[PDB]
């Protein structure tokens, strides 16, 4: 009786460090992408996570991530960066996005979905050029 109680306490102990690490990780989870919205890849939610939800349970915690998942991938033509031939130091680097040529000509699209929209200063930065960039002089952003 007592040595299967020894065993019982011993495996209770094992589940105790298991649940201690589990509780540490779980409170980390409810901190990172539940309170704020962190930028880790799959660390709390599979796929590109957006929103998370937390519910208690009589032996732990259940977590609900709802996140964007892509579909219908198609080929378009983007760019890397546009700098003037006469003024190489002026470049536009899209903040969290990519280029497109549609000519409704260079315009902006996000990093997730086919959402083209024209070149705006509000979602780009200025960085020094490199040897492998693109030059144009016929139609330029403000």
């Amino acid at each position: 009786r007592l040595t299967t109680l020894n065993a019982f306490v011993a495996q209770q102990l094992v589940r105790s460090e298991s649940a201690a690490l589990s509780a540490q990780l779980a409170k980390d989870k409810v901190n990172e992408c539940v309170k704020a919205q962190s930028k880790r890849s799959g660390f709390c939610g599979q796929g590109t996570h957006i929103v998370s939800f937390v519910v208690n349970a009589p032996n732990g915690l259940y977590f609900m991530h709802v996140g964007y998942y892509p579909s219908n991938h198609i080929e378009v033509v983007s760019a890397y960066g546009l700098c003037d031939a006469a003024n190489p130091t002026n470049c536009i680097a899209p903040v969290n996005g990519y280029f497109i040529k549609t000519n409704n000509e260079w315009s902006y699209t996000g990093s997730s979905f086919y959402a083209p929209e024209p070149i705006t200063s509000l979602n780009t930065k200025y960085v020094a050029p490199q040897v492998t960039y693109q030059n144009i002089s016929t139609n330029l952003p403000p």
């Binding site: 589940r15 915690l61 991530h65 198609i74 983007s78």
Partner: protein
């Protein structure tokens, strides 16, 4: 060991290349034989591995024989759970053994033995079918699987690879982009055993049930329960 009638079918050559049993006058078990040149000390004839298993033997004619032992078929059987399709898989072996020479207790062929040679080995109970299922949850080793589908037999399939959308790398300043044009909201749900049920018990009821002779005898170990 005591003597026996020998005849021809007792030599190493009489059972070369066969999964047989061996009795090297006390060193007994089940072994295989393969013809090999003189390895190790000739005078010993009893050479063991790092884990106390005979690895060879010098025969009387001077031919050495590697003892790789009577390794069986590498045994597996699969059953598609509670859809009545179960069939057996033989790891990395030809179909040189068939549904005749078994033992154990028995084996049920059900309907109608029959080679299903595959990269995992030799399968019995399947039929060849070049099927490609990516999301299958019934793997058969390496890249082998089976189709759930919707009184017959069970068909073969492969663990398919979902090829990514291929985009050609361009050394030119122009480049081609691969973009998703449709979006969804996948739900990833997880559970964490943050709290265990906080269960306790004492030594006088679980271990003693309040019996007085038990109560006085329990104090000999005493502080153990404490």
């Amino acid at each position: 060991c005591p003597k026996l009638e020998f005849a021809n079918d007792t030599k190493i050559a009489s059972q070369l290349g066969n999964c047989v049993e061996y009795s090297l006058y006390g060193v007994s078990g089940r072994g295989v034989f393969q013809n090999c040149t003189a390895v190790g000390v000739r005078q010993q004839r009893f050479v063991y591995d790092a884990y106390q298993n005979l690895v060879g033997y010098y025969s009387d004619d001077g031919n050495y024989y590697c003892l790789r032992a009577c390794v069986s078929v590498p045994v597996s059987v699969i059953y598609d759970k509670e859809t009545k399709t179960h069939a057996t898989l033989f790891g990395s072996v030809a179909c040189e053994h068939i549904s005749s020479t078994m033992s154990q207790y028995s084996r049920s062929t059900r309907s109608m033995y029959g080679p299903l040679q595959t990269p995992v080995g030799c399968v019995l109970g399947l039929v060849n079918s070049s099927l490609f299922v990516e999301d299958c949850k019934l793997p058969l080793g390496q890249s082998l699987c089976a189709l759930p589908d919707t009184p017959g037999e069970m068909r073969l399939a492969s663990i398919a690879f979902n090829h990514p959308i291929q985009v050609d790398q361009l050394n030119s300043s122009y480049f081609k982009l691969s973009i998703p044009t449709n979006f969804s909201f996948g739900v990833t749900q997880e559970y964490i055993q943050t709290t265990i049920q906080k269960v306790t018990v004492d030594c006088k009821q679980y271990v003693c049930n309040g019996f007085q002779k038990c109560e006085q005898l329990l104090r000999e170990y005493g502080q153990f329960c404490s």
